[PDB]
């Protein structure tokens, strides 16, 4: 079950859980989101259609000039993606709106349609997403990180603790709609519900109940239960309920029929309730003093003269009990309250409600909302009925209304978009019950409260904003009834809409530079989930509920992969299987568990519904039919996992990588690392700069291939076929005839990207991993980009590390790297800087790029060509002139004796100043490119035409090669059609090939296909013609530079950094350390066989930093290279494919019950020698994250090689040749080279530039500015008595403008002594204080 | 208000014209005048503001029509200017960015911290002038008072 | 030169907000002089005096009487009081701790062979920190004729 | 401006003020409780 | 040392003090009451045998637990 | 291009070698470069002031 | 070597399901996800300190 190019290097997969659901498209979020956005589906689906349906049509305010929306279209980009990268312009698509404007010439009837104007107006260019879910916004490549913001709905938060300083938890609910006013129901330290509409004063909570036309009686009927008293011949007997008298204190002796159950003072038992039900007692006799404190339920009036004996919410008393018995009342209904569970809150909040009836409720709401205005009946009722109950203003969106219904345990998933009295009452009910103990508040760091945005939603929102601005402006224009003389083009702008979407995609906190020193960086920065930016919390505000990881993250956000440091827990990253709901919530798949068998149908559960079900565990065996083998299985029900019955589970997890992200899936042995260690490991792995040539992990987790293919660096097949021509630049694929369309014969052709600078200046380029005439299949890798080997992500190199001290050279976390590691060039990296020389137009005159530069030797201009620019390929070192340029400078007013020294030697003073672009200090790399842009209508120099002539020749010669490829394929298909029915055997190939498009055949549908092929060939000829013409016209156009510049000369340099002391290397388990020496090979701790270890690592970093994963991977890598050494020996002392096949088949089974059934008998004998060659340097080994190889498997694989089972070797000192006591761990560990390169960290300065306003060291060489001698260092030098050090550190070396130039003389004069003076910081401060009215002077 | 006093002293009942339509004439005049005068730090005169305004008004038009964007070639086409003073006009229109712009850096840095100094002479270039003064005083000392005095004086 | 207006790349200048505030004070002061010498309607003169007062207070301490004005790019213009005070002011951030010459920065490694009083300093990082001393010592030993 | 400091929701930083400006701001508050027509800005005045 | 190396001491203090306060919440000594201090009923032999020195019956304990759950 | 820092001092600096960096300054004048020799020198400071 | 004992949620809420495993032997998915709680709390706390 392995493809042809999949027995090249098969990874021996450990891991026993079969895979039920293959890893989805990793970049699915970005891609399908924008496909949602830039999409023509005329319905309720979001996108641009939604924006235009919302804002249009527009109408005059009874002036009746309707400007309505007809349709729209996406105009194709005027520049390719790569030309947008080169020429410094975003990659957009003009957005045409077929708009229509009917003039409602209104007389009758009711404004009939009079005349119409349809026009296609242009409103902004919307940036587009490339094939890899990324944008090109100014030539730089950017990514719109998805945002995770709270949703419309109702949330019950407590605000426990610090509030009120009495310890008492508060409880407030909030209805936050998509658009409208908030609505808060806040408890208070004295328990009575309040209200607070947006942030106004806290009205009571019964005022809104009254505003809904609820009188007191049915309000108390809503929020309470009822206790019934009646005079059944003994003084208002009680209508007793069994359950309600639980956990109470006996207020009296509750007895029945002579049966004594409750003695007062005797607190109620549960035995008491069990017996009160076992006797079925409902009507009892009680003291008359019990009804004293309680509260009536309805306004009890008398009928003698309508005597208001008692109204609702009026507590009784024995006097009112007498007044109630005297008027002959039997029913006495009271609020059943109790301070434990049925707390009285509505009662007290009515007793504090200063209002009594509805209209006063409205008027107090009005005085709250819009104060000062005298309120009235009509305006108040209108305000209330247009607060939340009018679709004009309020909007609980579908997201919000779904959340609202689901939060109150409703079954209707979609209702109105406006609040109902039922809805508000139910919110208050649920809030009171959350106060009662029935339920507990939601955690606002829930993943069920926060929904996810994306680039296809935030762009659309910015578009709606621009549309609303332009619609208001169009209303303003149309209100002035000019005439029929205009169609909807002059009334519509483009600066507003274009400016809105531009200021989104170009300067936002969610539109970031794409990380590019990896496949992993790109593909894991397109999957980020930020909580910053617009519409979400911020590092300032947040916060510690948000930094944290809630139980709902399982399968939705990686809990171990987050950028630690300042914003940790604010940039959480998606997991592998996590999709987004239709509403924006994050779903993860679970295999449905039927009666007892795990069905293979997966349900994508959201984060809100996931708590109801008993979701089982992925580490769960199965009886080969979906049957759990254990008695009770471990599941997780509502946050907390536990043992649950086998025939109780509703779901099982899909795989065990379901919880770790794409980054934290490439860590072998994640199970064995301390979680913070895996966090630092994923973060550091996300920076491993590519090396000169890639190298597969000797110990992987199988996810490298998915990550590399899902990324875009790899070039992979669109259709299977035979590789007809390979090359460093391009691959050509004669398509398999089965996968070929009917017409347009064709053969695929992939032009690889050779050397080019990433966003981090590291190198991007692709190598063909397929040879001439090699069968490719669809979805297969033909070009392995940077950091990938045969389509497997390879950030590092597997180095032979020995865990041992070695003389202090790895003291804290240093790494002692041998010199064979820098000899063999297995950490050299290629770095592509770009320098640029712009020739602006100063007032004194435009500058020039002449190679006649003043005051320079004839060696300095050796490398420059005739026009000034450097040659291509000129090896350069720091200081050399890349682009000689001279600026106009005249005059200068030379001084005295310099005057005499120019009058003596007669060397004139040149009227030009030297400002040429020279290589930085320290950089030393070949100039691999030169690009010259010019202002339009400015004479191109001699060497700006040596580029365009060569570029036109290359373009036409490439569109010639491609048309020869395509015509070769078409003629091959034509010949194949003439294999029968028109077959000329041996001079058909001799005939003119142009005399093939209409050759004589049996004129059946075969001739139809041949006419297809001929017409395809002619269309191809014309297509290549106009391709070359448009390419020429684009190459020979004047580039558009920013104003003031004439020509920009860009020079791309390709330095080759080599690993050296100072540079920072790291394993994948978060074991960082800067390599702090390069040892001779003869000093490395070698073994009895003679081989030196390559790297030496401190043992002591394992126990403290609890990451056993790194030593486990040392052992397993030693095993995997030991199974490769045997194969290599067998392959050099040639045995034959039989015995080699035998050993590989042994090494490939080698474990417990694993799903890596591989048998080397379905392999052609030369298919086993390609494999046997690619396993020569060690066999790869897969190890899924929490499904890895167990230690017994490691020992067995060691024993299969001839290594020691203990994982440890005896090693001899390289220098003294003696043997280390206590054998050492030595194994092959995968080591990454982060780009915290020392060649960038190291800088220094003595005297350079200075700032203009605050004359302090500025620098600007990145960074020639000195070091910031901050405040803590001032205290450190006051701690010593170092007064002179401090003084010179803040006056002579920093600020004092005379003292510093005066001391640079004294240093050179052999005199180490300064005259400090007074810092220009203090002179400026004096000038500023004095520039107030404050006279500040210096008393002599 | 100042233009209103101006028009009130120049309002006439003899045409029988209502006050507002004419005082608003004078008021729009004076208000646009003071806008063009004191709304920009680097004062361009009022005619330059009118020229940049007509350039902008022919820019939105040429954008909505020609699809892509105006250009100095296109604008010198549609407008009656010589293709180069339009260059300098569109160079002139932009506002000085504030020197307290919050830069996109770590230290809360601003745009005023990176503006280097092009007038200062580097202390290698003052100690390369005092060395020259000493050298010339030496080489002149190797000379008669005739040459020395006449060269220090010339 | 404390409130400078500096030429940037492209001819678009760069100015400190104090020029905006001084300009707003000066225009309003000239207009008050104008209105005073017109015998203007004294309510307009009241408004001019009030606006000039507000301008002088934005100049002295913006955002201390009303709301910060404004700024031209929708951010509160900083005034002299803002130039002194604040964590990012002048008493604190360049008065107590400032940038310093004769200083470098590099990744530290270990090197266990050192004696306790000494540390390895890269040759490349040392040839830049001691350039004055090296120029002096070259010109002193006669290995080089002059400082150049 | 007198202190306490206002917010919207181990709060141990410092007080910063004061016995002189405390009663000053308290006096201004007691007065401003009766400040009826006190917009106090130019555009509205 | 590294940010993952003092974060350990933070988490360690945290879980340590948490377990400490919780296993201090338990009662190990003996002062046999034989009757609740809230409802007066005899704390049964079973409950008083699980927790030596229990001071309240089951239901009074549940009530007080709920009340303290609201933090009142 | 990397400062080699004596191991014993790293407890003083609270500095390990996982990529940390350090700033170097030159005490220029005579009185300022006898204070690095007499007060701020690594050998005179072996006891913690706390 | 021993067991990892009881994890703790960030607000001091000790989880009752204890990680009865060490890093030498494995940690299955649920125990690891439980431990990440206190892990990230400690990390965020030393991001302020
Ligand atoms: C003959 C062979 C097919 C086998 C029959 C044909 C099929 C397409 C041909 C290549 C392409 O044209 C591109 C390119 C054009 C250059 O100009 C010359 C070199 C290249 C590589 C060509 C060589 C050769 O001719 C190829 C492989
Ligand atoms: C370092 C900073 C990025 C950090 C976020 C970049 C982004 C834009 C840069 C300025 C502009 O280019 C204008 C100007 C160009 C001159 O030629 C050199 C100085 C200037 C002031 C530059 C300083 C600095 O370099 C800036 C602020
Ligand atoms: C606010 C923005 C932050 C970037 C995130 C800052 C950082 C540096 C600023 C630019 C530089 O000054 C160079 C240039 C000077 C021109 O004259 C005016 C335009 C330019 C492009 C400036 C506009 C803007 O202000 C920039 C982009
Ligand atoms: C982790 C921390 C060191 C940080 C480096 C040490 C230093 C002091 C320790 C606490 C106290 O000892 C009191 C108490 C003792 C009990 O025995 C166990 C719990 C207590 C709360 C301890 C928890 C923890 O162990 C502490 C915070
Ligand atoms: Mg460190
Ligand atoms: Zn009890």
Curated annotation (Swiss-Prot), chain A:
HAMAP family membership: RNApol_bact_RpoB
Record protein name field: DNA-directed RNA polymerase subunit beta
Annotated GO MF terms: DNA binding; DNA-directed RNA polymerase activity; ribonucleoside binding
Keyword vocabulary terms for this entry: Acetylation, DNA-directed RNA polymerase, Nucleotidyltransferase, Transcription, Transferase
GO biological process terms held by the UniProt record: DNA-templated transcription
Entries under InterPro entries matching the protein: DNA-dir_RNA_pol_bsu_ext_1_sf (IPR042107), DNA-dir_RNA_pol_bsu_external_1 (IPR019462), DNA-dir_RNA_pol_su2 (IPR015712), DNA-dir_RNAP_su2_dom (IPR007120), DNA-dir_RNAP_su2_hyb_sf (IPR037033), RNA_pol_bsu_bac (IPR010243), RNA_pol_bsu_CS (IPR007121), RNA_pol_bsu_protrusion (IPR007644)
Function, as annotated: DNA-dependent RNA polymerase catalyzes the transcription of DNA into RNA using the four ribonucleoside triphosphates as substrates.
PROSITE patterns tied to this protein: RNA_POL_BETA
Record-stated family: Belongs to the RNA polymerase beta chain family.
Annotated catalysed reactions: RNA(n) + a ribonucleoside 5'-triphosphate = RNA(n+1) + diphosphate
Record Pfam families: RNA_pol_Rpb2_1, RNA_pol_Rpb2_2, RNA_pol_Rpb2_3, RNA_pol_Rpb2_45, RNA_pol_Rpb2_6, RNA_pol_Rpb2_7
Source species, domain of life: Bacteria
Self-association state and partner proteins as the record states: The RNAP catalytic core consists of 2 alpha, 1 beta, 1 beta' and 1 omega subunit. When a sigma factor is associated with the core the holoenzyme is formed, which can initiate transcription.
Disulfide bonds: none
Curated annotation (Swiss-Prot), chain E:
Keyword set includes Zinc: yes
Keywords carried by this UniProt record: Metal-binding, Plasmid, Zinc, Zinc-finger
Gene Ontology molecular function terms on file: zinc ion binding
UniProt cross-references to InterPro entries, sorted A to Z: Znf_C4-type_bac, Znf_C4_TraR, Znf_DskA_TraR, Znf_DskA_TraR_CS
Zinc finger intervals, dksA C4-type: 36-60
Gene3D superfamilies: DksA, coiled-coil domain
Metal-binding in keyword set: yes
Protein name in UniProt: Protein TraR
Organism for this UniProt entry: Escherichia coli (strain K12)
Lineage of the species this protein comes from: Bacteria, Pseudomonadati, Pseudomonadota, Gammaproteobacteria, Enterobacterales
Curated annotation (Swiss-Prot), chain F:
Boundaries of the shown chain within the full protein: 445 to 494 of 1407
Organism this protein belongs to: Escherichia coli (strain K12)
Assembly information from the UniProt record: The RNAP catalytic core consists of 2 alpha, 1 beta, 1 beta' and 1 omega subunit. When a sigma factor is associated with the core the holoenzyme is formed, which can initiate transcription. The rRNA transcription and antitermination complex (rrnTAC) consists of RNAP, NusA, NusB, NusE (rpsJ), NusG, SubB, ribosomal protein S4, DNA and precursor rRNA; S4 is more flexible than other subunits.
Modifications the protein undergoes after translation, according to the UniProt entry: Acetylated on several lysine residues in the presence of glucose.
UniProt function note: DNA-dependent RNA polymerase (RNAP) catalyzes the transcription of DNA into RNA using the four ribonucleoside triphosphates as substrates. Resistance to the antibiotics salinamide A, salinamide B, rifampicin, streptolydigin, CBR703, myxopyronin, and lipiarmycin can result from mutations in this protein.
Residues where Mg(2+) binds: 16, 18, 20
Name of the protein in its database record: DNA-directed RNA polymerase subunit beta'
Biotechnology: Co-administration of salinamide and rifampicin or salinamide and myxopyronin suppresses the emergence of resistance to both antibiotics.
Similarity comment text for this entry: Belongs to the RNA polymerase beta' chain family.
Swiss-Prot record, chain G:
Effect noted on mutating residue 18 to S/T: Resistant to antibiotics salinamide A and B
Origin superkingdom: Bacteria
Biotechnology: Co-administration of salinamide and rifampicin or salinamide and myxopyronin suppresses the emergence of resistance to both antibiotics.
Post-translational modification: Acetylated on several lysine residues in the presence of glucose.
Record-annotated disulphide pairs: none
Annotated consequence of substituting residue 40 to C: Resistant to antibiotics salinamide A and B
Family of the protein in this entry: Belongs to the RNA polymerase beta' chain family.
Assembly and oligomerization: The RNAP catalytic core consists of 2 alpha, 1 beta, 1 beta' and 1 omega subunit. When a sigma factor is associated with the core the holoenzyme is formed, which can initiate transcription. The rRNA transcription and antitermination complex (rrnTAC) consists of RNAP, NusA, NusB, NusE (rpsJ), NusG, SubB, ribosomal protein S4, DNA and precursor rRNA; S4 is more flexible than other subunits.
Function: DNA-dependent RNA polymerase (RNAP) catalyzes the transcription of DNA into RNA using the four ribonucleoside triphosphates as substrates. Resistance to the antibiotics salinamide A, salinamide B, rifampicin, streptolydigin, CBR703, myxopyronin, and lipiarmycin can result from mutations in this protein.
Name under which the protein is recorded: DNA-directed RNA polymerase subunit beta'
Lineage summary: Bacteria, Pseudomonadati, Pseudomonadota, Gammaproteobacteria, Enterobacterales
Shown part of the complete sequence: 741 to 789 of 1407
């Amino acid at each position: 079950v392995y493809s042809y190019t999949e027995k090249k290097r098969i990874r021996k997969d450990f891991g026993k859980r079969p895979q039920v659901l293959d890893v989805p498209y990793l970049l699915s979020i970005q891609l399908d989101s924008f496909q949602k956005f830039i999409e023509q589906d005329p319905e309720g689906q979001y996108g641009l259609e939604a924006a235009f349906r919302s804002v249009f049509p527009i109408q005059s305010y009874s002036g009746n000039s309707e400007l309505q929306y007809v349709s729209y279209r996406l105009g194709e980009p005027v520049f390719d993606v790569q030309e947008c990268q080169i020429r410094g312009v975003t990659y957009s698509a003009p957005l045409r709106v077929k708009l229509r404007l009917v003039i409602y010439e209104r007389e009758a009837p009711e404004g009939t349609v009079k005349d119409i104007k349809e026009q296609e107006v242009y409103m902004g260019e919307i940036p587009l997403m490339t094939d890899n879910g990324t944008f090109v916004i100014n030539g730089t490549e950017r990514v719109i990180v998805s945002q995770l913001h709270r949703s419309p709905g109702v949330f019950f938060d407590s605000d426990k603790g610090k509030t009120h300083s009495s310890g008492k938890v508060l409880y407030n609910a909030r209805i936050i709609p998509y658009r409208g006013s908030w609505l808060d129901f806040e408890f208070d330290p004295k328990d009575n519900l309040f209200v607070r509409i947006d942030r106004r004063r806290k009205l009571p909570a019964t005022i809104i109940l009254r505003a809904l036309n609820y009188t007191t009686e049915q309000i108390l009927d809503l929020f309470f239960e009822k206790v019934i008293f009646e005079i059944r011949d003994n003084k208002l007997q009680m209508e007793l309920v069994p359950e309600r008298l639980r956990g109470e204190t006996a207020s009296f002796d509750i007895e029945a029929n002579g049966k004594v159950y409750v003695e007062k003072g005797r607190r109620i038992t549960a035995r008491h309730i069990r017996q009160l039900e076992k006797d079925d007692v409902k009507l009892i006799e009680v003291p008359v003093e019990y009804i004293a404190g309680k509260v009536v339920a309805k306004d009890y009036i008398d009928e003698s003269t309508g005597e208001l004996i008692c109204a609702a919410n009026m507590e009784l008393s024995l006097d009112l009990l007498a007044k109630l018995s005297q008027s002959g009342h039997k029913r006495i209904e009271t609020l059943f309250t109790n301070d434990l569970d049925h707390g009285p809150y509505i009662s007290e909040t009515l007793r504090v409600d200063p209002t009594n009836d509805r209209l006063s409720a409205l008027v107090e709401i009005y005085r709250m909302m819009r104060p000062g205005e005298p309120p009235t009946r009509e305006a108040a009722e209108s305000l209330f009925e247009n607060l939340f109950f009018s679709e004009d203003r309020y909007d609980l969106s579908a997201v919000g209304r779904m959340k609202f219904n689901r939060s109150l345990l409703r079954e209707e998933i979609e209702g109105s978009g406006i609040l109902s009295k039922d809805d508000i009452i139910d919110v208050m009910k649920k809030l009171i019950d959350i106060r009662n103990g029935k339920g507990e508040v939601d955690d606002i760091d829930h993943l069920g409260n926060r929904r996810i945005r994306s680039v296809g939603e935030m762009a659309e929102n910015q578009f709606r904003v621009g549309l609303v601005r332009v619609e208001r402006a169009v209303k303003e224009r149309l209100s002035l009834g000019d005439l029929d003389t205009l169609m909807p083009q002059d009334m519509i702008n483009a600066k507003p809409i274009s400016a809105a979407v531009k200021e989104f995609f170009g300067s936002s906190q969610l539109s970031q530079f794409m990380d590019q020193n990896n496949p992993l960086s790109e593909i894991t920065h397109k999957r980020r989930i930020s909580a910053l930016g617009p519409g979400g919390l911020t590092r300032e505000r947040a916060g510690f509920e948000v930094r944290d990881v809630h139980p709902t993250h399982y399968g939705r956000v990686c809990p171990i992969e987050t950028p630690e440091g300042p914003n940790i827990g604010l940039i959480n990253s998606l997991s592998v299987y996590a999709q987004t709901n239709e509403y924006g919530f994050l779903e993860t798949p679970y295999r449905k568990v039927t009666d007892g068998v795990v069905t293979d149908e997966i349900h994508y559960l959201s984060a809100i519904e996931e708590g109801n079900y008993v979701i089982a565990q992925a580490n769960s065996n199965l009886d080969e039919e979906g049957h759990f083998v254990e008695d009770l299985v471990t599941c997780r029900s509502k946050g907390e996992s536990s043992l649950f019955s086998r025939d109780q589970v509703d779901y099982m997890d899909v795989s065990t990588q379901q919880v770790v992200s794409v980054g934290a899936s490439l860590i072998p042995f994640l199970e064995h690392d301390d979680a913070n260690r895996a966090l630092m490991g994923a973060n550091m792995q996300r920076q491993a700069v590519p090396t000169l040539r890639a190298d597969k992990p000797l110990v992987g987790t199988g996810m490298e291939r998915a990550v590399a293919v899902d990324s875009g660096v790899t070039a992979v097949a669109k259709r299977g076929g035979v590789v007809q021509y390979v090359d460093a630049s391009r691959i050509v694929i004669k398509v398999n005839e089965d996968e070929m369309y009917p017409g347009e014969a064709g053969i695929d052709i992939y032009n690889l990207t050779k050397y080019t600078r990433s966003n981090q200046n590291t190198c991007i380029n692709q190598m063909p991993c397929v040879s001439l005439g090699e069968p490719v299949e669809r979805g297969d890798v033909l070009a392995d980009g940077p950091s990938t080997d045969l389509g497997e992500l390879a950030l590092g190199q597997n180095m032979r590390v020995a865990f041992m001290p070695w003389n202090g050279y790895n003291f804290e976390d240093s790494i002692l790297v041998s010199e064979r590691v820098v000899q063999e060039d297995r950490f050299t990296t290629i770095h592509i800087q770009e320098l640029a020389c712009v020739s602006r137009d100063t007032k004194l005159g435009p500058e020039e790029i002449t190679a006649d530069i003043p005051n320079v030797g004839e060696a300095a201009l050796s490398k420059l060509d005739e026009s000034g620019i450097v040659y291509i390929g000129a090896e350069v070192t720091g200081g050399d002139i890349l682009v000689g340029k001279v600026t106009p400078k005249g005059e200068t007013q030379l001084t005295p004796e310099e005057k005499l020294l120019r009058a003596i030697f007669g060397e004139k003073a040149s009227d030009v100043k030297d400002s040429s672009l020279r290589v930085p200090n320290g950089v030393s790399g070949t100039v691999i490119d030169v690009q010259v842009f010019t202002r339009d209508g400015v004479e191109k120099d001699k060497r700006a035409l040596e580029i365009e002539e060569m570029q036109l020749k290359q373009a036409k010669k490439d569109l010639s090669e491609e048309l020869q490829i395509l015509e070769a394929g078409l003629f091959s298909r034509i010949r194949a059609v003439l294999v029968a029915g028109g077959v000329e055997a041996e001079k058909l190939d001799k005939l003119p090939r142009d005399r093939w498009l209409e050759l004589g055949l049996t004129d059946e549908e075969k001739q139809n296909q041949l006419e297809q092929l001929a017409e395809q060939y002619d269309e191809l000829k014309h297509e290549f013609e106009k391709k070359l013409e448009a390419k020429r016209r684009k190459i020979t156009q004047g580039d558009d530079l920013a104003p003031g510049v004439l020509k920009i000369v860009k020079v791309y340099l390709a330095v080759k950094r080599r690993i050296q002391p100072g540079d920072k290397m790291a394993g994948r388990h978060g074991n960082k350390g800067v390599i702090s020496k390069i040892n001779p090979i003869e000093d490395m701790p070698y073994d009895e066989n003679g081989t030196p270890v390559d790297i030496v690592l401190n043992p002591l970093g394992v126990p403290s930093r609890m990451n056993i994963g790194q030593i486990l991977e040392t052992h397993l890598g030693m095993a995997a290279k030991g199974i490769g050494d045997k194969i290599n020996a067998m392959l050099k002392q040639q045995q034959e494919v039989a015995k080699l096949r035998e050993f590989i088949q042994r090494a490939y089974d080698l474990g417990a019950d694993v799903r890596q059934k591989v048998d080397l008998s379905t392999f052609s004998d030369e298919e086993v020698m390609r494999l046997a060659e690619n396993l020569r340097k060690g066999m790869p080994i897969a190890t899924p994250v929490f499904d890895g190889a167990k230690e017994a498997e490691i020992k067995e694989l060691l024993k299969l090689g001839d290594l020691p089972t203990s994982g440890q070797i005896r090693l001899y000192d390289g220098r003294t040749g003696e043997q280390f006591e206590r054998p050492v761990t030595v194994g092959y560990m995968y080591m990454l080279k982060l780009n915290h390169l020392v060649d960038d960290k190291m800088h220094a300065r003595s005297t350079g530039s200075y700032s203009l306003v605050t004359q302090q060291p500025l620098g600007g060489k990145a960074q020639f500015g000195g070091q910031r001698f901050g405040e803590m260092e001032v205290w450190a030098l006051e701690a010593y008595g170092a007064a002179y050090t401090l003084q010179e550190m803040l006056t002579v070396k920093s600020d004092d403008v005379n003292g510093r130039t005066k001391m640079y003389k004294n240093i050179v004069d052999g005199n180490h002594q300064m005259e400090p003076g007074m810092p220009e910081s203090f002179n400026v401060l004096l000038k500023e204080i004095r520039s107030l009215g404050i006279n500040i002077e210096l008393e002599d | 208000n100042i233009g209103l006093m101006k028009a009130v002293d120049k309002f006439e009942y003899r045409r029988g014209y209502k006050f507002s339509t004419y005082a608003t004439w004078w008021i729009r005049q004076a208000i646009t005048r003071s806008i063009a005068d004191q709304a920009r730090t680097i004062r361009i005169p009022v005619h330059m503001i009118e020229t940049i305004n007509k350039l902008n008004r022919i820019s939105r038009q040429m954008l909505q029509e020609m699809g892509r964007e105006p250009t100095p070639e296109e604008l010198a086409e549609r407008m009656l200017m010589p293709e180069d003073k339009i260059r300098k006009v569109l160079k002139i229109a932009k506002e000085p960015i504030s020197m307290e712009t919050p830069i996109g850096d770590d230290e809360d840095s601003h745009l005023g911290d990176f503006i280097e100094d092009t007038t200062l002479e580097l202390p290698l270039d003052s100690a390369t002038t005092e060395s020259l003064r000493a050298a010339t005083h030496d080489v002149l000392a190797g000379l008669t008072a005739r040459e020395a005095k006449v060269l220090r004086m010339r | 030169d404390l409130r400078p207006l500096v030429p940037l790349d492209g001819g678009r200048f760069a100015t400190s907000d104090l020029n905006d505030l001084y300009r707003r004070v000066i225009n309003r002061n000239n207009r008050l002089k104008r209105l005073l010498d017109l015998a203007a309607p004294d309510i307009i003169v009241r408004n001019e005096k009030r606006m000039l007062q507000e301008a002088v207070d934005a100049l002295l301490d913006n955002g201390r009487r009303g709301r910060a004005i404004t700024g031209s790019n929708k951010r509160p213009l900083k005034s002299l009081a803002d130039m002194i005070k604040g964590k990012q002011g002048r008493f604190r951030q360049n008065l107590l701790g400032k940038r310093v010459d004769y200083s470098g920065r590099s990744v530290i490694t270990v090197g266990p062979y050192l004696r306790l009083h000494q540390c390895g300093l890269p040759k490349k990082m040392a040839l830049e920190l001691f350039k004055p001393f090296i120029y002096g010592k070259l010109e002193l030993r006669g290995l080089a004729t002059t400082i150049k | 401006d007198m202190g306490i400091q206002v917010m919207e929701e181990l709060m141990l930083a410092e007080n910063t003020a004061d016995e002189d400006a405390a009663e000053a701001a308290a006096q201004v508050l007691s007065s401003v409780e009766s400040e009826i027509g006190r917009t106090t800005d130019p555009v509205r005045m | 040392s590294d940010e993952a190396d003092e974060a350990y001491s933070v988490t360690e203090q945290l879980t340590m003090t948490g377990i400490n306060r919780i296993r201090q919440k338990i009662n190990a000594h003996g002062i046999p009451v034989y009757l609740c201090e809230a409802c007066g009923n005899p704390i049964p032999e079973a409950r008083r045998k699980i927790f030596p020195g229990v001071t309240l019956c089951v239901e009074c304990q549940a009530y007080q637990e709920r009340q303290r759950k609201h933090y009142a | 291009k990397a400062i080699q820092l004596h191991p014993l001092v790293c407890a003083a600096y609270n500095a390990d070698f996982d990529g940390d960096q350090m700033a170097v300054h030159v005490p220029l004048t005579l009185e300022a470069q006898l204070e690095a020799r007499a007060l701020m020198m690594s050998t005179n400071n072996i006891l913690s002031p706390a | 070597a021993g067991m990892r004992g009881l994890m703790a949620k960030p607000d001091g809420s000790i989880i009752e399901t204890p990680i009865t495993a060490n890093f030498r032997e494995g940690l299955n998915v649920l125990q690891y996800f439980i431990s990440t709680h206190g892990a990230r709390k400690g990390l965020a706390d030393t991001a302020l300190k």
